[PDB]
Design a protein around this ligand. Structure first.
Ligand SMILES: *[C@@H]1O[C@H](CO)[C@@H](O[C@@H]2O[C@H](CO)[C@@H](O[C@@H]3O[C@H](CO[C@H]4O[C@H](CO[C@H]5O[C@H](CO)[C@@H](O)[C@H](O)[C@@H]5O)[C@@H](O)[C@H](O[C@H]5O[C@H](CO)[C@@H](O)[C@H](O)[C@@H]5O[C@H]5O[C@H](CO)[C@@H](O)[C@H](O)[C@@H]5O)[C@@H]4O)[C@@H](O)[C@H](O[C@H]4O[C@H](CO)[C@@H](O)[C@H](O)[C@@H]4O[C@H]4O[C@H](CO)[C@@H](O)[C@H](O)[C@@H]4O)[C@@H]3O)[C@H](O)[C@H]2NC(C)=O)[C@H](O)[C@H]1NC(C)=O
Ligand SMILES: O=C(CCc1ccc(OC(F)(F)F)cc1)N1C[C@@H]2CN(C(=O)c3ccc4[nH]nnc4c3)C[C@H]2C1
Ligand SMILES: [Ca+2]
Ligand SMILES: [Zn+2]
Ligand SMILES: [Zn+2]
Length: 804
């Protein structure tokens, strides 16, 4: 109930929320059906429009006007945004040359530059260049301030997940808004755009910027705007809030525009009808900046121009129907469109089986435009699994397509030429970032980055301590003139052991064999030096990774590679080796095909054994340092140590071997050497975080050898590729992957063909950030370079996306 008999007199867009049943006057009151009787009359005036003209200059103040051109309007804070231009001979902000803001220039009483976030729905990155001729104000922000060529949204590339990610710094799986539509089985409740459930606070996890500010005593404007409130009125309300007295005035503000998303769904991303919405946005920016000039705040406020996602070409005719694949289409519930989520229609049908649904959906049609996954097998870069609201079965839809249950769902619910939601590495889904103000750099371009990183910077711009989030604090310091946050490396938790030769061969009983009884201080003091780490500076280029948890591990040195060998998981956590541009690929000699050799530095009881792989008919083994890249016949024997061995499914060995025999050499040729770090990952509970020993769900049969869920590699070289990887004086370049360790290649529909046609395509789909690997392993990389730590953090967040 709302007794809406109170009055908004003197309260229009008040900042406190008055509780039920007393009526409200805040910018959300419509959406809650709770406004006071006179809200429209007093708070949403429209008389005479939004601009001053010549003949209003110095008028008599009349309070019914939407905005004023009277002499007292600056005092009152309520002039039309163009008042000084028309009535006092001033220029529009956009017509002024830009001049560096080297220091804030704020009026008396401003404790800190305010932040204004100007958010635009569906603003595709390529609009900044392709629309620049009709967007002069936005183009001046971009060229004068700090801009990226694009910003990467989160998955799914929908509005609510992305706007709440911007506000919290968290992945959707962590903040809880995993879609525009959701079912929560614990609550037994549904979230939708139409209805009242989406208001309940229980959907909304984490801590958004406006709460963070409030708890730390920085005042915030209200971020949400009811769709009927026109843009011009949104802008004037922000400016009115900016003339409030010092003790009452917010320091952070948001504007939001439904455009150009709205028009983009109807007309497609580059439909001729899209020029007009882009003009309109620019005009709105122009009003804000002119309004800031009038208040003397245009060299004081930091402004962020930011989008939630892009837009792609999508039509009704490009729909796949689950009814053309499944027999029992009526026993499922599908969340449809640019992504697919499937669960059982009824909780009381135990003739529901995901395995059979998946299999009926896997590589069934030659051109099939979606690919089914169990959520834990989705590429780890999407971070889209660890929430009860994400259904176990997921369909990743190709760009330009939709998935639906049956054809009647499409025509009886074409009407649209654009949509969004696809994989967040797709170029059409990329969106924008520009920062302009005293705290941002002047005429600076920065590389593309992820929207999960912005919360930290918005906290820095306001002097706030960010709540715990998924950004890497410091990774965006190169956007800022000052207010940098100066991070320190985490402390290493476990120190390694450095074992020497401690065991005789006969103490081992591993069931392994090797034809190595083939037999001098010349070549012998020399191989001893190799076991104490004489070549370690060639192979470990950025220092040893640090172990950030408690555990027991050994550093092992070899001529061609170095490892950190876990006595608990019985395999390396990491294996590091450098492959120069001149290196040669060899084969495994015929006598050495099944060679595995005990390591006399490591005890029997902390070693794998070959009997277990013999008895496990499902499981085979591979090596982390590849024998194919040994520097000499004699060095090759090191590559067959039991301490370099890791469990691999025969199907995964096809992928692994091709990566080791062909691609590493190819990368070395192309990048002028590469340093490689490889190893395993255990993430059985799909939370993106390393599993502890007591959480392992699968072992090589009859043994304590744990089976990895994934295998990673980090591949590093010199950004200036005229220098070799191992003698690089400047910035680095990296790419990485986290491959799923799976017993089949069902993910790859061409996998019966030669590896040269499908392996690299799988690896690109499972591209990753070094940071992603950090979370999954509890390791910390690049500890000893000559680069600044901020730069290294930027490198660790880089994602190689293989879009052109
Ligand atoms: C991305 O960044 C995020 C954020 O940093 C990372 O997410 C964090 O990861 C932590 C590890 O997974 C996790 O720690 C948990 O916390 C449990 C308690 O947490 C509740 O409180 C949180 C804080 O809110 C308060 O914030 C400020 C302080 O900062 C206060 O002033 C306020 O008063 C606030 O209340 C809260 O965020 C959290 O919310 C989740 O659940 C809500 C409702 O269900 C949602 O609204 C919201 O979206 C959150 O949902 C996500 O996170 C939960 C996991 O918490 C997840 O299940 C959902 O799917 C969703 O993804 C909580 O309400 C604490 O109980 C945990 O401790 C157990 O484990 C330890 C291990 O050391 C045990 O030793 C300990 O005994 C304990 O075990 C007991 O429970 C076991 C399992 O139930 C049981 O078997 C056992 O026998 C024991 O009884 C643990 O510390 C953080 O909560 C989490 N934060 C967020 C926001 O997600 C994330 O990892 C990053 N991602 C990557 C890839 O890096
Ligand atoms: O008022 C706000 C956000 C305030 C905000 C701003 C910045 C912000 O970010 C930051 F915090 F960083 F500032 C957070 C919240 N909203 C009201 C809107 C209603 N909506 C849709 O009807 C809609 C729109 C596009 C679609 N395409 N397909 N379906 C769609 C459905 C989306 C909404 C969000
Ligand atoms: Ca885990
Ligand atoms: Zn949107
Ligand atoms: Zn949209």
């Amino acid at each position: 109930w709302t007794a809406t008999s109170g009055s908004c007199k003197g309260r229009c867009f008040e900042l406190q929320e008055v509780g039920p049943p007393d009526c409200r006057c805040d910018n959300l009151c419509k959406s809650y059906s709770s406004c006071c009787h006179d809200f429209d009359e007093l708070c949403l005036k429209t008389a005479r429009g939004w601009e001053c003209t010549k003949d209003r200059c110095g008028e008599v103040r009349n309070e019914e006007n939407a905005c004023h051109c009277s002499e007292d309007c600056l005092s009152r804070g309520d002039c039309c945004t163009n008042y000084q231009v028309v009535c006092k001979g001033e220029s529009h902000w956009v017509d002024d040359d830009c001049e560096e803001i080297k220091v804030p220039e704020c009026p008396a009483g401003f404790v800190r530059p305010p932040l204004i976030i100007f958010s635009v729905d569906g603003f595709r990155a390529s609009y900044m260049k392709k629309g620049s001729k009709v967007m002069p104000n936005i183009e001046k922000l971009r060229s004068c301030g700090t801009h990226a060529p694009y910003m990467r949204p989160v998955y799914p590339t929908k509005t609510f997940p992305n706007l709440y990610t911007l506000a919290t710094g968290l992945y959707p799986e962590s903040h809880g808004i995993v879609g525009n539509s959701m079912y929560d089985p614990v609550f037994d409740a549904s979230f939708h755009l139409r209805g009242r459930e989406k208001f309940n606070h229980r959907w909304w996890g984490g801590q958004p910027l406006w709460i963070t500010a409030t708890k730390q005593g920085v005042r915030a404007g209200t971020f949400f705007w009811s769709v009927s409130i026109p843009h011009e009125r949104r802008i004037l309300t922000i400016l009115q809030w900016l003339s409030l007295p010092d003790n009452e005035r917010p320091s952070v503000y948001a504007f939001y525009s439904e455009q150009p998303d709205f028009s983009g769904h109807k007309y497609g991303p580059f439909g001729p009808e899209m020029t007009n919405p882009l003009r309109e946005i620019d005009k709105t920016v122009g009003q804000l900046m002119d309004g800031l000039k009038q208040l003397r705040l245009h060299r004081c406020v930091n402004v962020i121009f930011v989008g939630d996602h892009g837009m792609e070409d999508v039509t009704c005719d490009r729909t796949e129907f689950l009814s053309n694949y499944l027999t029992n289409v009526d026993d499922i519930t599908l969340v449809p469109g640019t992504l697919g989520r499937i669960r059982a229609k009824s909780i009381n049908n135990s003739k529901y089986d995901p395995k059979t649904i998946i299999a009926a959906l896997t590589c069934k049609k030659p051109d099939q435009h979606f690919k089914p996954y169990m959520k834990q097998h989705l590429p780890k870069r999407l971070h889209y699994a660890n929430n009860r609201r994400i259904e176990d079965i997921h369909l990743l839809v190709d760009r330009r397509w939709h998935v639906a249950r049956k054809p009647l769902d499409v025509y009886k619910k074409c009407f649209f030429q654009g949509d969004h939601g696809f994989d967040n590495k797709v170029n059409s889904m990329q969106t924008v970032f520009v920062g302009y103000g005293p705290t941002f750099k002047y005429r600076t371009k920065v590389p593309p980055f992820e929207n999960i990183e912005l919360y930290n910077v918005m906290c820095d711009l306001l002097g706030l301590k960010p709540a715990p989030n998924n950004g890497t604090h410091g990774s965006l310091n190169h956007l800022l003139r000052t207010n940098t946050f100066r991070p320190t490396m985490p402390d290493e938790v476990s120190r390694p052991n450095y074992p020497g030769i401690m065991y005789l061969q006969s103490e081992f009983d591993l069931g392994c064999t090797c034809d190595d009884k083939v037999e001098n201080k010349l070549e012998e003091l020399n191989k001893r030096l190799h076991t104490k780490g004489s070549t370690k500076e060639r192979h470990l280029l950025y220092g040893r990774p640090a172990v950030l948890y408690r555990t027991s591990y050994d550093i092992l040195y070899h001529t061609d590679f170095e490892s950190g060998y876990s006595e608990i998981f019985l395999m390396p956590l990491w294996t590091s080796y450098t492959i120069s541009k001149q290196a040669e690929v060899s084969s495994i000699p015929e006598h050495l095909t099944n060679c595995v050799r005990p390591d006399v530095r490591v005890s029997p009881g902390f070693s794998q054994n070959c009997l277990a792989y013999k008895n496990d008919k499902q499981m085979s083994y591979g090596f982390l340092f590849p024998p194919y890249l040994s520097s000499s016949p004699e060095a090759k024997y090191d590559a067959f140590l039991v301490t370099n061995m890791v469990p691999m499914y025969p199907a995964f060995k096809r992928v692994w071997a091709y990566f080791q025999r062909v691609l590493v050499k190819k990368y070395a040729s192309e990048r002028n050497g590469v340093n490689v770090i490889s190893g395993p990952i255990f993430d059985y509970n799909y939370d993106g975080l390393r599993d502890t020993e007591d959480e392992i769900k699968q072992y090589v049969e009859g043994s304590s050898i744990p089976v990895p869920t994934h295998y990673y590699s980090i591949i590093t070289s010199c950004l200036d590729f005229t220098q070799p990887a191992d003698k690089c004086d400047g910035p680095l370049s990296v790419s990485s992957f986290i491959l799923p360790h799976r017993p089949d290649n069902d993910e790859s529909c061409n996998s019966s063909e030669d590896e040269s046609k499908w392996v690299e395509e799988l690896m690109k789909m499972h591209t990753a950030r070094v940071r992603d690997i950090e979370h999954l392993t509890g390791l910390d990389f690049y500890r000893k370079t000559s680069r600044s730590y901020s730069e290294i953090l930027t490198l660790k967040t880089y994602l190689h996306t293989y879009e052109s």
